[PDB]
Write a structure and sequence with these properties.
The chain is mainly α and about 55 residues long. It has one domain. The chain is built from 3 helices and no strands. The longest helix is centred in the N-terminal third of the chain and has 14 residues. It is classed as cell adhesion. The entry lists the keywords integrin beta3, GPIIIa.
Length: about 55
């Protein structure tokens, strides 16, 4: 039951306050466009062209 093992990690991470602190930090650093979803969308597009049907 690999799912059970993963769940355990979530508990440990959730317990770590540092994890929550990082979450808010990411949102704060969302001022740039590179960290904006649009940036990721553009990357995925290139992946397709740089590697289509092949």
């Amino acid at each position: 039951s690999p799912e059970c093992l993963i769940w355990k990690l979530l508990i440990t991470i959730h317990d770590r306050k540092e994890f929550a602190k990082f979450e808010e930090e990411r949102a704060r650093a969302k001022w740039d466009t590179a960290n904006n979803p649009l940036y990721k969308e553009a990357t995925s597009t290139f992946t397709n062209i740089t590697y289509r049907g092949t």
